Structure formats: C-alpha cells, structure tokens
Amino acid sequence: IVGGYTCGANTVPYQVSLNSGYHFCGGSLINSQWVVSAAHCYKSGIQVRLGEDNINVVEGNEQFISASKSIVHPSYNSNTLNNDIMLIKLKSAASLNSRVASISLPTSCASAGTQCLISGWGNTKSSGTSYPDVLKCLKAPILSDSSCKSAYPGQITSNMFCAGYLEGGKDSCQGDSGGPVVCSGKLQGIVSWGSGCAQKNKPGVYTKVCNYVSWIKQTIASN
Ligand SMILES: CCOC(=O)c1ccc(O)cc1
Ligand SMILES: *C(=O)CCCCCNC(=N)N
Ligand SMILES: [Ca+2]
C-alpha cells in the first residue's frame, strides 16, 4: 500500500497473509474454513496466516493453517485477468475470535464514490521497493465506469472496477494482490492489477466480488 497508514494490530481481522516460506499475496476470510483471494495468486504449498499484524514476528493471536484446496475460477484468463478470483479451503477450521473474523459478502454491488478500505503488506513505495512489517490501510473511493475505462481503454471488463486516486500517491501495490476492498462491512473487491503503483491517472483495478456471490456459495456448498 502506497500513501496509506498503519492499520493497528488486528483492526482488519478478516485480512490474511498467504505464505509459501514468505508473504506473497493477501486474502479475505469469509467463513471459518474458506478464504477469498486472486486467481493470479495461485500456487501449491499455500499456508494461510490469520490474525497477523507483524508478519515477521510471532506476537500472539496468529493461526497458521495449510490450504487443503485452492480453486481458481474456471474462466480466469491469465492475460486479461478477467475473473481474477480464487477460493482457498483451509485444512481445518480457523477458530474465530475478535482478532480472526470473517467478512460478509455483498448483497448488491457498490456505486461509484463509495468509500472503501484496502489493506495489505505490499510495497509502500511508488518509486523503488520497501516492504512493511505491519499491516497497512488506505481509504479509497470506487471510480465511475467512464473514468475507469478512460484510464484503461479496452481493458476493463464488467468483472472489474477502479478505485483510488487519479492524482497519484495513494494506491495498492505488489504484495497487496488478493487482498480485500471492503465497503460498509462488505467485501466488494479483490486487489487485482494496475499500471505501476500510485501513478497519476492510473488507479488500481479490482475484481468485482458482487458478480461472484452465487459462484462462491455454490463452490463452497459442493466442496
Ligand atoms: C488487458 C489486461 O491488462 C493487461 O494487459 C495487464 C495484465 C496484467 C498486468 O499486471 C497489467 C496489465
Ligand atoms: C499484486 O500484488 C499485483 C500488483 C498489482 C497490485 C495493484 N496495482 C495497483 N493498484 N496499481
Ligand atoms: Ca506475526
């Protein structure tokens, strides 16, 4: 996250870190046994780390749980990033508490101008590379469809939305991928792609979770 702020320990209790011997992507806990992330974050050997703040120090409240299944959307396209969504089943159920909690799926889509919270352990620099120990947060609005298409002509499908700031300096970044965009207590987005980080006129692009509620429910119900 570039131009954000320190969230504070466990203030984003649905935020998870996906770890393969290092932090590689974020994700969102949606019930005690299932996590939502980006399809482009797929690999084998995923360990889900819940209740994290400092991802480099054991502080208390952490639960490390191996993924038993990682389910990429069958229509995920690795070149366009259309359908950039993946479900991860945990080998065992997380124990839920004030510091490890699920986030509700949306009942309807959010409108342009809705303020959201984006969080993650990604790069905090627009220029060069700096990775934080602790979780970073950013408040950001969802942009209009016309602004989003103007920013990324021919690249925005109906399964994507833009959020952030056209002036530059505030954005999600590498390492934030797969993490949550939460608007009034609902998971509306997943960190997906963008052109550089925090560049003028190049906002972040996010998977539109409201288009996938039925698929999520059906996939969970059958696994
Ligand atoms: C047409 C989809 O947009 C891209 O070409 C694109 C894909 C991945 C990425 O990181 C940036 C742009
Ligand atoms: C995931 O970490 C791949 C990097 C894309 C993150 C989103 N980029 C952006 N908001 N400019
Ligand atoms: Ca820790």
JSON list of C-alpha atoms and ligand atoms in Angstrom, two decimals:
[
{"chain": "A", "resi": 1, "resn": "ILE", "atom": "CA", "xyz": [0.00, 0.00, 0.00]},
{"chain": "A", "resi": 2, "resn": "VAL", "atom": "CA", "xyz": [1.45, 3.39, -1.05]},
{"chain": "A", "resi": 3, "resn": "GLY", "atom": "CA", "xyz": [0.42, 6.52, 0.86]},
{"chain": "A", "resi": 4, "resn": "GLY", "atom": "CA", "xyz": [-1.62, 4.62, 3.44]},
{"chain": "A", "resi": 5, "resn": "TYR", "atom": "CA", "xyz": [-1.27, 4.34, 7.23]},
{"chain": "A", "resi": 6, "resn": "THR", "atom": "CA", "xyz": [-0.57, 1.67, 9.86]},
{"chain": "A", "resi": 7, "resn": "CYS", "atom": "CA", "xyz": [-3.92, -0.10, 10.47]},
{"chain": "A", "resi": 8, "resn": "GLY", "atom": "CA", "xyz": [-3.14, -1.04, 14.09]},
{"chain": "A", "resi": 9, "resn": "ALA", "atom": "CA", "xyz": [-2.82, -4.66, 15.32]},
{"chain": "A", "resi": 10, "resn": "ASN", "atom": "CA", "xyz": [-5.83, -6.81, 14.38]},
{"chain": "A", "resi": 11, "resn": "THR", "atom": "CA", "xyz": [-8.10, -3.89, 13.32]},
{"chain": "A", "resi": 12, "resn": "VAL", "atom": "CA", "xyz": [-8.67, -5.74, 9.98]},
{"chain": "A", "resi": 13, "resn": "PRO", "atom": "CA", "xyz": [-9.49, -9.15, 11.46]},
{"chain": "A", "resi": 14, "resn": "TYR", "atom": "CA", "xyz": [-10.60, -10.75, 8.11]},
{"chain": "A", "resi": 15, "resn": "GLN", "atom": "CA", "xyz": [-7.24, -9.89, 6.49]},
{"chain": "A", "resi": 16, "resn": "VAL", "atom": "CA", "xyz": [-4.98, -12.90, 5.81]},
{"chain": "A", "resi": 17, "resn": "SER", "atom": "CA", "xyz": [-1.43, -13.40, 4.52]},
{"chain": "A", "resi": 18, "resn": "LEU", "atom": "CA", "xyz": [-0.76, -16.19, 2.03]},
{"chain": "A", "resi": 19, "resn": "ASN", "atom": "CA", "xyz": [2.70, -17.61, 2.76]},
{"chain": "A", "resi": 20, "resn": "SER", "atom": "CA", "xyz": [4.92, -20.05, 0.86]},
{"chain": "A", "resi": 21, "resn": "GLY", "atom": "CA", "xyz": [8.03, -19.52, 3.03]},
{"chain": "A", "resi": 22, "resn": "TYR", "atom": "CA", "xyz": [7.40, -15.78, 2.60]},
{"chain": "A", "resi": 23, "resn": "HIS", "atom": "CA", "xyz": [4.40, -13.44, 2.20]},
{"chain": "A", "resi": 24, "resn": "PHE", "atom": "CA", "xyz": [3.28, -13.39, -1.42]},
{"chain": "A", "resi": 25, "resn": "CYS", "atom": "CA", "xyz": [-0.38, -12.30, -1.52]},
{"chain": "A", "resi": 26, "resn": "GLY", "atom": "CA", "xyz": [-3.27, -11.17, 0.70]},
{"chain": "A", "resi": 27, "resn": "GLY", "atom": "CA", "xyz": [-6.73, -12.70, 1.05]},
{"chain": "A", "resi": 28, "resn": "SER", "atom": "CA", "xyz": [-10.02, -12.35, 2.99]},
{"chain": "A", "resi": 29, "resn": "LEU", "atom": "CA", "xyz": [-11.54, -14.78, 5.47]},
{"chain": "A", "resi": 30, "resn": "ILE", "atom": "CA", "xyz": [-15.21, -15.34, 4.50]},
{"chain": "A", "resi": 31, "resn": "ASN", "atom": "CA", "xyz": [-16.04, -18.14, 6.95]},
{"chain": "A", "resi": 32, "resn": "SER", "atom": "CA", "xyz": [-14.10, -20.32, 9.41]},
{"chain": "A", "resi": 33, "resn": "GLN", "atom": "CA", "xyz": [-12.92, -22.59, 6.61]},
{"chain": "A", "resi": 34, "resn": "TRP", "atom": "CA", "xyz": [-12.73, -20.51, 3.41]},
{"chain": "A", "resi": 35, "resn": "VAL", "atom": "CA", "xyz": [-10.64, -17.62, 2.13]},
{"chain": "A", "resi": 36, "resn": "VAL", "atom": "CA", "xyz": [-11.16, -15.44, -0.96]},
{"chain": "A", "resi": 37, "resn": "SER", "atom": "CA", "xyz": [-8.09, -14.27, -2.94]},
{"chain": "A", "resi": 38, "resn": "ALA", "atom": "CA", "xyz": [-6.98, -13.51, -6.56]},
{"chain": "A", "resi": 39, "resn": "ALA", "atom": "CA", "xyz": [-6.64, -16.34, -9.12]},
{"chain": "A", "resi": 40, "resn": "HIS", "atom": "CA", "xyz": [-3.31, -14.89, -10.24]},
{"chain": "A", "resi": 41, "resn": "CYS", "atom": "CA", "xyz": [-2.04, -15.65, -6.71]},
{"chain": "A", "resi": 42, "resn": "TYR", "atom": "CA", "xyz": [-2.47, -19.41, -7.23]},
{"chain": "A", "resi": 43, "resn": "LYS", "atom": "CA", "xyz": [0.37, -21.81, -6.44]},
{"chain": "A", "resi": 44, "resn": "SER", "atom": "CA", "xyz": [0.74, -25.07, -4.49]},
{"chain": "A", "resi": 45, "resn": "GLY", "atom": "CA", "xyz": [2.02, -25.21, -0.89]},
{"chain": "A", "resi": 46, "resn": "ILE", "atom": "CA", "xyz": [-0.04, -22.25, 0.38]},
{"chain": "A", "resi": 47, "resn": "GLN", "atom": "CA", "xyz": [-0.09, -21.68, 4.16]},
{"chain": "A", "resi": 48, "resn": "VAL", "atom": "CA", "xyz": [-2.82, -19.30, 5.35]},
{"chain": "A", "resi": 49, "resn": "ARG", "atom": "CA", "xyz": [-1.79, -16.97, 8.14]},
{"chain": "A", "resi": 50, "resn": "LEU", "atom": "CA", "xyz": [-4.60, -15.44, 10.16]},
{"chain": "A", "resi": 51, "resn": "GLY", "atom": "CA", "xyz": [-4.58, -12.89, 13.00]},
{"chain": "A", "resi": 52, "resn": "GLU", "atom": "CA", "xyz": [-1.34, -11.34, 11.66]},
{"chain": "A", "resi": 53, "resn": "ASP", "atom": "CA", "xyz": [-0.05, -7.84, 12.22]},
{"chain": "A", "resi": 54, "resn": "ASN", "atom": "CA", "xyz": [3.76, -8.01, 12.07]},
{"chain": "A", "resi": 55, "resn": "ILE", "atom": "CA", "xyz": [4.31, -10.80, 9.53]},
{"chain": "A", "resi": 56, "resn": "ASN", "atom": "CA", "xyz": [7.98, -11.15, 10.52]},
{"chain": "A", "resi": 57, "resn": "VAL", "atom": "CA", "xyz": [7.47, -11.64, 14.28]},
{"chain": "A", "resi": 58, "resn": "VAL", "atom": "CA", "xyz": [5.39, -14.14, 16.30]},
{"chain": "A", "resi": 59, "resn": "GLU", "atom": "CA", "xyz": [3.37, -11.78, 18.55]},
{"chain": "A", "resi": 60, "resn": "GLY", "atom": "CA", "xyz": [0.41, -13.87, 19.68]},
{"chain": "A", "resi": 61, "resn": "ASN", "atom": "CA", "xyz": [-3.05, -14.34, 18.09]},
{"chain": "A", "resi": 62, "resn": "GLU", "atom": "CA", "xyz": [-1.64, -15.92, 14.89]},
{"chain": "A", "resi": 63, "resn": "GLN", "atom": "CA", "xyz": [-3.10, -19.08, 13.42]},
{"chain": "A", "resi": 64, "resn": "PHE", "atom": "CA", "xyz": [-1.19, -20.80, 10.61]},
{"chain": "A", "resi": 65, "resn": "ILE", "atom": "CA", "xyz": [-3.32, -23.22, 8.61]},
{"chain": "A", "resi": 66, "resn": "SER", "atom": "CA", "xyz": [-2.42, -25.13, 5.43]},
{"chain": "A", "resi": 67, "resn": "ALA", "atom": "CA", "xyz": [-4.70, -24.82, 2.41]},
{"chain": "A", "resi": 68, "resn": "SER", "atom": "CA", "xyz": [-6.37, -28.14, 1.54]},
{"chain": "A", "resi": 69, "resn": "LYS", "atom": "CA", "xyz": [-7.85, -26.88, -1.80]},
{"chain": "A", "resi": 70, "resn": "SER", "atom": "CA", "xyz": [-7.22, -23.81, -3.97]},
{"chain": "A", "resi": 71, "resn": "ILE", "atom": "CA", "xyz": [-9.98, -23.24, -6.54]},
{"chain": "A", "resi": 72, "resn": "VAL", "atom": "CA", "xyz": [-9.27, -20.78, -9.35]},
{"chain": "A", "resi": 73, "resn": "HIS", "atom": "CA", "xyz": [-12.31, -19.53, -11.26]},
{"chain": "A", "resi": 74, "resn": "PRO", "atom": "CA", "xyz": [-12.69, -21.85, -14.28]},
{"chain": "A", "resi": 75, "resn": "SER", "atom": "CA", "xyz": [-12.93, -18.79, -16.56]},
{"chain": "A", "resi": 76, "resn": "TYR", "atom": "CA", "xyz": [-9.91, -16.96, -15.15]},
{"chain": "A", "resi": 77, "resn": "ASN", "atom": "CA", "xyz": [-7.84, -15.60, -18.03]},
{"chain": "A", "resi": 78, "resn": "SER", "atom": "CA", "xyz": [-4.20, -15.03, -17.17]},
{"chain": "A", "resi": 79, "resn": "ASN", "atom": "CA", "xyz": [-3.65, -12.40, -19.89]},
{"chain": "A", "resi": 80, "resn": "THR", "atom": "CA", "xyz": [-6.69, -10.15, -19.36]},
{"chain": "A", "resi": 81, "resn": "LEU", "atom": "CA", "xyz": [-7.11, -11.02, -15.65]},
{"chain": "A", "resi": 82, "resn": "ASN", "atom": "CA", "xyz": [-10.85, -11.37, -16.24]},
{"chain": "A", "resi": 83, "resn": "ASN", "atom": "CA", "xyz": [-12.39, -13.47, -13.41]},
{"chain": "A", "resi": 84, "resn": "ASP", "atom": "CA", "xyz": [-9.38, -12.90, -11.13]},
{"chain": "A", "resi": 85, "resn": "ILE", "atom": "CA", "xyz": [-10.81, -14.76, -8.10]},
{"chain": "A", "resi": 86, "resn": "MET", "atom": "CA", "xyz": [-9.82, -17.90, -6.20]},
{"chain": "A", "resi": 87, "resn": "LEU", "atom": "CA", "xyz": [-11.24, -19.73, -3.21]},
{"chain": "A", "resi": 88, "resn": "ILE", "atom": "CA", "xyz": [-8.97, -21.43, -0.69]},
{"chain": "A", "resi": 89, "resn": "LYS", "atom": "CA", "xyz": [-10.26, -24.13, 1.68]},
{"chain": "A", "resi": 90, "resn": "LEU", "atom": "CA", "xyz": [-8.41, -24.42, 4.97]},
{"chain": "A", "resi": 91, "resn": "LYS", "atom": "CA", "xyz": [-7.23, -27.88, 6.12]},
{"chain": "A", "resi": 92, "resn": "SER", "atom": "CA", "xyz": [-9.05, -27.22, 9.41]},
{"chain": "A", "resi": 93, "resn": "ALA", "atom": "CA", "xyz": [-11.43, -24.51, 10.56]},
{"chain": "A", "resi": 94, "resn": "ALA", "atom": "CA", "xyz": [-9.94, -21.31, 11.97]},
{"chain": "A", "resi": 95, "resn": "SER", "atom": "CA", "xyz": [-11.07, -20.54, 15.48]},
{"chain": "A", "resi": 96, "resn": "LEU", "atom": "CA", "xyz": [-12.97, -17.25, 15.23]},
{"chain": "A", "resi": 97, "resn": "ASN", "atom": "CA", "xyz": [-12.38, -14.50, 17.82]},
{"chain": "A", "resi": 98, "resn": "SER", "atom": "CA", "xyz": [-12.15, -10.70, 17.94]},
{"chain": "A", "resi": 99, "resn": "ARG", "atom": "CA", "xyz": [-8.82, -10.87, 16.06]},
{"chain": "A", "resi": 100, "resn": "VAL", "atom": "CA", "xyz": [-9.76, -13.53, 13.47]},
{"chain": "A", "resi": 101, "resn": "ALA", "atom": "CA", "xyz": [-13.15, -12.86, 11.94]},
{"chain": "A", "resi": 102, "resn": "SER", "atom": "CA", "xyz": [-14.95, -13.37, 8.66]},
{"chain": "A", "resi": 103, "resn": "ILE", "atom": "CA", "xyz": [-16.13, -10.56, 6.37]},
{"chain": "A", "resi": 104, "resn": "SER", "atom": "CA", "xyz": [-19.59, -10.66, 4.81]},
{"chain": "A", "resi": 105, "resn": "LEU", "atom": "CA", "xyz": [-20.09, -10.98, 1.05]},
{"chain": "A", "resi": 106, "resn": "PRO", "atom": "CA", "xyz": [-22.10, -8.20, -0.64]},
{"chain": "A", "resi": 107, "resn": "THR", "atom": "CA", "xyz": [-25.85, -8.44, -1.37]},
{"chain": "A", "resi": 108, "resn": "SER", "atom": "CA", "xyz": [-25.61, -5.75, -4.04]},
{"chain": "A", "resi": 109, "resn": "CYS", "atom": "CA", "xyz": [-22.85, -4.00, -5.97]},
{"chain": "A", "resi": 110, "resn": "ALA", "atom": "CA", "xyz": [-21.43, -0.72, -4.69]},
{"chain": "A", "resi": 111, "resn": "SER", "atom": "CA", "xyz": [-21.79, 2.53, -6.59]},
{"chain": "A", "resi": 112, "resn": "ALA", "atom": "CA", "xyz": [-19.18, 5.00, -7.84]},
{"chain": "A", "resi": 113, "resn": "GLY", "atom": "CA", "xyz": [-17.98, 7.21, -5.00]},
{"chain": "A", "resi": 114, "resn": "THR", "atom": "CA", "xyz": [-18.46, 4.60, -2.25]},
{"chain": "A", "resi": 115, "resn": "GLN", "atom": "CA", "xyz": [-15.57, 4.84, 0.23]},
{"chain": "A", "resi": 116, "resn": "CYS", "atom": "CA", "xyz": [-13.74, 1.55, 0.88]},
{"chain": "A", "resi": 117, "resn": "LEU", "atom": "CA", "xyz": [-10.88, 0.18, 2.99]},
{"chain": "A", "resi": 118, "resn": "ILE", "atom": "CA", "xyz": [-7.99, -1.52, 1.14]},
{"chain": "A", "resi": 119, "resn": "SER", "atom": "CA", "xyz": [-5.34, -3.27, 3.24]},
{"chain": "A", "resi": 120, "resn": "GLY", "atom": "CA", "xyz": [-2.17, -5.32, 2.78]},
{"chain": "A", "resi": 121, "resn": "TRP", "atom": "CA", "xyz": [1.57, -5.93, 3.37]},
{"chain": "A", "resi": 122, "resn": "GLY", "atom": "CA", "xyz": [2.58, -4.86, -0.13]},
{"chain": "A", "resi": 123, "resn": "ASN", "atom": "CA", "xyz": [5.22, -2.38, -1.32]},
{"chain": "A", "resi": 124, "resn": "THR", "atom": "CA", "xyz": [4.86, 1.08, 0.27]},
{"chain": "A", "resi": 125, "resn": "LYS", "atom": "CA", "xyz": [6.86, 2.90, -2.44]},
{"chain": "A", "resi": 126, "resn": "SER", "atom": "CA", "xyz": [5.78, 4.25, -5.82]},
{"chain": "A", "resi": 127, "resn": "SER", "atom": "CA", "xyz": [9.49, 4.51, -6.67]},
{"chain": "A", "resi": 128, "resn": "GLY", "atom": "CA", "xyz": [11.65, 1.52, -5.72]},
{"chain": "A", "resi": 129, "resn": "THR", "atom": "CA", "xyz": [10.82, -1.18, -3.16]},
{"chain": "A", "resi": 130, "resn": "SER", "atom": "CA", "xyz": [10.03, -1.16, 0.59]},
{"chain": "A", "resi": 131, "resn": "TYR", "atom": "CA", "xyz": [8.02, -3.86, 2.40]},
{"chain": "A", "resi": 132, "resn": "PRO", "atom": "CA", "xyz": [6.39, -3.16, 5.76]},
{"chain": "A", "resi": 133, "resn": "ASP", "atom": "CA", "xyz": [6.41, -5.45, 8.79]},
{"chain": "A", "resi": 134, "resn": "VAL", "atom": "CA", "xyz": [2.90, -4.38, 9.86]},
{"chain": "A", "resi": 135, "resn": "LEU", "atom": "CA", "xyz": [-0.42, -4.16, 8.03]},
{"chain": "A", "resi": 136, "resn": "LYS", "atom": "CA", "xyz": [-1.12, -1.00, 6.06]},
{"chain": "A", "resi": 137, "resn": "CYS", "atom": "CA", "xyz": [-4.51, 0.51, 5.28]},
{"chain": "A", "resi": 138, "resn": "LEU", "atom": "CA", "xyz": [-5.84, 3.00, 2.69]},
{"chain": "A", "resi": 139, "resn": "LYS", "atom": "CA", "xyz": [-9.23, 4.65, 2.35]},
{"chain": "A", "resi": 140, "resn": "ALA", "atom": "CA", "xyz": [-10.22, 4.90, -1.32]},
{"chain": "A", "resi": 141, "resn": "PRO", "atom": "CA", "xyz": [-13.34, 5.64, -3.41]},
{"chain": "A", "resi": 142, "resn": "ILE", "atom": "CA", "xyz": [-14.74, 3.50, -6.21]},
{"chain": "A", "resi": 143, "resn": "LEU", "atom": "CA", "xyz": [-14.47, 5.42, -9.54]},
{"chain": "A", "resi": 144, "resn": "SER", "atom": "CA", "xyz": [-17.14, 5.87, -12.23]},
{"chain": "A", "resi": 145, "resn": "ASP", "atom": "CA", "xyz": [-17.23, 3.38, -15.11]},
{"chain": "A", "resi": 146, "resn": "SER", "atom": "CA", "xyz": [-16.32, 6.17, -17.56]},
{"chain": "A", "resi": 147, "resn": "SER", "atom": "CA", "xyz": [-13.25, 7.20, -15.52]},
{"chain": "A", "resi": 148, "resn": "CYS", "atom": "CA", "xyz": [-12.16, 3.58, -15.22]},
{"chain": "A", "resi": 149, "resn": "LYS", "atom": "CA", "xyz": [-12.49, 2.98, -18.99]},
{"chain": "A", "resi": 150, "resn": "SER", "atom": "CA", "xyz": [-10.71, 6.30, -19.75]},
{"chain": "A", "resi": 151, "resn": "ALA", "atom": "CA", "xyz": [-7.84, 5.16, -17.54]},
{"chain": "A", "resi": 152, "resn": "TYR", "atom": "CA", "xyz": [-7.54, 1.69, -19.10]},
{"chain": "A", "resi": 153, "resn": "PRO", "atom": "CA", "xyz": [-9.12, 1.71, -22.55]},
{"chain": "A", "resi": 154, "resn": "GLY", "atom": "CA", "xyz": [-10.32, -1.73, -23.73]},
{"chain": "A", "resi": 155, "resn": "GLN", "atom": "CA", "xyz": [-9.03, -3.47, -20.60]},
{"chain": "A", "resi": 156, "resn": "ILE", "atom": "CA", "xyz": [-11.92, -3.17, -18.13]},
{"chain": "A", "resi": 157, "resn": "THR", "atom": "CA", "xyz": [-14.49, -5.95, -18.16]},
{"chain": "A", "resi": 158, "resn": "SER", "atom": "CA", "xyz": [-17.80, -5.98, -16.25]},
{"chain": "A", "resi": 159, "resn": "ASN", "atom": "CA", "xyz": [-15.98, -8.07, -13.61]},
{"chain": "A", "resi": 160, "resn": "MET", "atom": "CA", "xyz": [-13.62, -5.23, -12.72]},
{"chain": "A", "resi": 161, "resn": "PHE", "atom": "CA", "xyz": [-13.80, -1.80, -11.05]},
{"chain": "A", "resi": 162, "resn": "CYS", "atom": "CA", "xyz": [-11.34, 1.01, -10.43]},
{"chain": "A", "resi": 163, "resn": "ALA", "atom": "CA", "xyz": [-10.81, 2.61, -7.04]},
{"chain": "A", "resi": 164, "resn": "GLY", "atom": "CA", "xyz": [-8.31, 5.10, -5.75]},
{"chain": "A", "resi": 165, "resn": "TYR", "atom": "CA", "xyz": [-6.89, 8.45, -6.82]},
{"chain": "A", "resi": 166, "resn": "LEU", "atom": "CA", "xyz": [-6.12, 9.88, -10.23]},
{"chain": "A", "resi": 167, "resn": "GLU", "atom": "CA", "xyz": [-3.70, 12.47, -8.83]},
{"chain": "A", "resi": 168, "resn": "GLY", "atom": "CA", "xyz": [-1.24, 9.74, -7.79]},
{"chain": "A", "resi": 169, "resn": "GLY", "atom": "CA", "xyz": [0.44, 8.92, -4.47]},
{"chain": "A", "resi": 170, "resn": "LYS", "atom": "CA", "xyz": [-2.21, 6.59, -2.94]},
{"chain": "A", "resi": 171, "resn": "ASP", "atom": "CA", "xyz": [-2.73, 3.02, -4.22]},
{"chain": "A", "resi": 172, "resn": "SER", "atom": "CA", "xyz": [-2.47, -0.70, -3.55]},
{"chain": "A", "resi": 173, "resn": "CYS", "atom": "CA", "xyz": [0.81, -2.27, -4.82]},
{"chain": "A", "resi": 174, "resn": "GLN", "atom": "CA", "xyz": [2.82, -5.51, -5.37]},
{"chain": "A", "resi": 175, "resn": "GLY", "atom": "CA", "xyz": [2.24, -7.87, -2.42]},
{"chain": "A", "resi": 176, "resn": "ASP", "atom": "CA", "xyz": [-1.27, -6.48, -1.82]},
{"chain": "A", "resi": 177, "resn": "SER", "atom": "CA", "xyz": [-2.71, -8.69, -4.59]},
{"chain": "A", "resi": 178, "resn": "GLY", "atom": "CA", "xyz": [-5.56, -10.95, -3.50]},
{"chain": "A", "resi": 179, "resn": "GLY", "atom": "CA", "xyz": [-6.38, -8.70, -0.53]},
{"chain": "A", "resi": 180, "resn": "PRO", "atom": "CA", "xyz": [-9.70, -7.05, 0.48]},
{"chain": "A", "resi": 181, "resn": "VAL", "atom": "CA", "xyz": [-11.59, -3.95, -0.66]},
{"chain": "A", "resi": 182, "resn": "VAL", "atom": "CA", "xyz": [-14.30, -3.57, 2.00]},
{"chain": "A", "resi": 183, "resn": "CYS", "atom": "CA", "xyz": [-17.09, -1.02, 1.71]},
{"chain": "A", "resi": 184, "resn": "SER", "atom": "CA", "xyz": [-19.60, -0.63, 4.58]},
{"chain": "A", "resi": 185, "resn": "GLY", "atom": "CA", "xyz": [-18.78, -4.08, 6.01]},
{"chain": "A", "resi": 186, "resn": "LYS", "atom": "CA", "xyz": [-19.00, -5.95, 2.70]},
{"chain": "A", "resi": 187, "resn": "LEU", "atom": "CA", "xyz": [-16.19, -7.44, 0.64]},
{"chain": "A", "resi": 188, "resn": "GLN", "atom": "CA", "xyz": [-16.72, -5.64, -2.69]},
{"chain": "A", "resi": 189, "resn": "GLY", "atom": "CA", "xyz": [-13.27, -6.03, -4.26]},
{"chain": "A", "resi": 190, "resn": "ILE", "atom": "CA", "xyz": [-10.07, -8.06, -4.53]},
{"chain": "A", "resi": 191, "resn": "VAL", "atom": "CA", "xyz": [-6.71, -6.40, -5.30]},
{"chain": "A", "resi": 192, "resn": "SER", "atom": "CA", "xyz": [-6.10, -7.46, -8.90]},
{"chain": "A", "resi": 193, "resn": "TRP", "atom": "CA", "xyz": [-3.92, -5.29, -11.18]},
{"chain": "A", "resi": 194, "resn": "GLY", "atom": "CA", "xyz": [-2.82, -1.81, -12.28]},
{"chain": "A", "resi": 195, "resn": "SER", "atom": "CA", "xyz": [-0.08, 0.01, -14.22]},
{"chain": "A", "resi": 196, "resn": "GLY", "atom": "CA", "xyz": [2.78, 0.65, -11.82]},
{"chain": "A", "resi": 197, "resn": "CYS", "atom": "CA", "xyz": [1.69, 1.83, -8.37]},
{"chain": "A", "resi": 198, "resn": "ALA", "atom": "CA", "xyz": [0.25, 5.19, -7.35]},
{"chain": "A", "resi": 199, "resn": "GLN", "atom": "CA", "xyz": [0.90, 6.70, -10.81]},
{"chain": "A", "resi": 200, "resn": "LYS", "atom": "CA", "xyz": [-1.09, 9.72, -11.93]},
{"chain": "A", "resi": 201, "resn": "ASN", "atom": "CA", "xyz": [-4.18, 8.70, -13.94]},
{"chain": "A", "resi": 202, "resn": "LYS", "atom": "CA", "xyz": [-3.52, 5.00, -13.33]},
{"chain": "A", "resi": 203, "resn": "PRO", "atom": "CA", "xyz": [-5.78, 3.85, -10.47]},
{"chain": "A", "resi": 204, "resn": "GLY", "atom": "CA", "xyz": [-5.99, 0.32, -9.04]},
{"chain": "A", "resi": 205, "resn": "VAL", "atom": "CA", "xyz": [-8.14, -2.32, -10.70]},
{"chain": "A", "resi": 206, "resn": "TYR", "atom": "CA", "xyz": [-10.15, -4.70, -8.52]},
{"chain": "A", "resi": 207, "resn": "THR", "atom": "CA", "xyz": [-12.17, -7.89, -9.04]},
{"chain": "A", "resi": 208, "resn": "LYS", "atom": "CA", "xyz": [-15.91, -7.10, -8.67]},
{"chain": "A", "resi": 209, "resn": "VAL", "atom": "CA", "xyz": [-16.91, -9.56, -5.94]},
{"chain": "A", "resi": 210, "resn": "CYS", "atom": "CA", "xyz": [-20.67, -8.87, -6.23]},
{"chain": "A", "resi": 211, "resn": "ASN", "atom": "CA", "xyz": [-20.63, -10.70, -9.61]},
{"chain": "A", "resi": 212, "resn": "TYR", "atom": "CA", "xyz": [-19.38, -13.88, -7.91]},
{"chain": "A", "resi": 213, "resn": "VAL", "atom": "CA", "xyz": [-21.55, -14.29, -4.78]},
{"chain": "A", "resi": 214, "resn": "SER", "atom": "CA", "xyz": [-23.59, -17.17, -6.29]},
{"chain": "A", "resi": 215, "resn": "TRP", "atom": "CA", "xyz": [-20.48, -18.94, -7.63]},
{"chain": "A", "resi": 216, "resn": "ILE", "atom": "CA", "xyz": [-18.78, -18.59, -4.26]},
{"chain": "A", "resi": 217, "resn": "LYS", "atom": "CA", "xyz": [-21.77, -20.03, -2.41]},
{"chain": "A", "resi": 218, "resn": "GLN", "atom": "CA", "xyz": [-22.18, -22.93, -4.88]},
{"chain": "A", "resi": 219, "resn": "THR", "atom": "CA", "xyz": [-18.49, -23.78, -4.92]},
{"chain": "A", "resi": 220, "resn": "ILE", "atom": "CA", "xyz": [-18.32, -23.79, -1.11]},
{"chain": "A", "resi": 221, "resn": "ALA", "atom": "CA", "xyz": [-21.51, -25.85, -0.85]},
{"chain": "A", "resi": 222, "resn": "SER", "atom": "CA", "xyz": [-20.07, -28.54, -3.16]},
{"chain": "A", "resi": 223, "resn": "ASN", "atom": "CA", "xyz": [-16.54, -28.75, -1.61]},
{"chain": "B", "resi": 1, "resn": "LIG", "atom": "C1", "xyz": [-5.70, -6.47, -20.96]},
{"chain": "B", "resi": 1, "resn": "LIG", "atom": "C2", "xyz": [-5.39, -6.77, -19.48]},
{"chain": "B", "resi": 1, "resn": "LIG", "atom": "O1", "xyz": [-4.46, -5.83, -18.90]},
{"chain": "B", "resi": 1, "resn": "LIG", "atom": "C3", "xyz": [-3.16, -6.24, -19.03]},
{"chain": "B", "resi": 1, "resn": "LIG", "atom": "O2", "xyz": [-2.60, -6.42, -20.12]},
{"chain": "B", "resi": 1, "resn": "LIG", "atom": "C4", "xyz": [-2.44, -6.41, -17.85]},
{"chain": "B", "resi": 1, "resn": "LIG", "atom": "C5", "xyz": [-2.30, -7.68, -17.28]},
{"chain": "B", "resi": 1, "resn": "LIG", "atom": "C6", "xyz": [-1.56, -7.83, -16.11]},
{"chain": "B", "resi": 1, "resn": "LIG", "atom": "C7", "xyz": [-0.96, -6.72, -15.52]},
{"chain": "B", "resi": 1, "resn": "LIG", "atom": "O3", "xyz": [-0.24, -6.87, -14.37]},
{"chain": "B", "resi": 1, "resn": "LIG", "atom": "C8", "xyz": [-1.09, -5.46, -16.09]},
{"chain": "B", "resi": 1, "resn": "LIG", "atom": "C9", "xyz": [-1.83, -5.30, -17.26]},
{"chain": "B", "resi": 2, "resn": "LIG", "atom": "C1", "xyz": [-0.46, -7.85, -6.86]},
{"chain": "B", "resi": 2, "resn": "LIG", "atom": "O1", "xyz": [0.19, -7.61, -5.84]},
{"chain": "B", "resi": 2, "resn": "LIG", "atom": "C2", "xyz": [-0.02, -7.43, -8.25]},
{"chain": "B", "resi": 2, "resn": "LIG", "atom": "C3", "xyz": [0.29, -5.94, -8.25]},
{"chain": "B", "resi": 2, "resn": "LIG", "atom": "C4", "xyz": [-0.95, -5.19, -8.62]},
{"chain": "B", "resi": 2, "resn": "LIG", "atom": "C5", "xyz": [-1.48, -4.52, -7.40]},
{"chain": "B", "resi": 2, "resn": "LIG", "atom": "C6", "xyz": [-2.48, -3.47, -7.81]},
{"chain": "B", "resi": 2, "resn": "LIG", "atom": "N1", "xyz": [-1.82, -2.36, -8.50]},
{"chain": "B", "resi": 2, "resn": "LIG", "atom": "C7", "xyz": [-2.20, -1.09, -8.38]},
{"chain": "B", "resi": 2, "resn": "LIG", "atom": "N2", "xyz": [-3.21, -0.78, -7.57]},
{"chain": "B", "resi": 2, "resn": "LIG", "atom": "N3", "xyz": [-1.58, -0.13, -9.05]},
{"chain": "B", "resi": 3, "resn": "CA", "atom": "CA", "xyz": [3.14, -12.14, 13.43]}
]
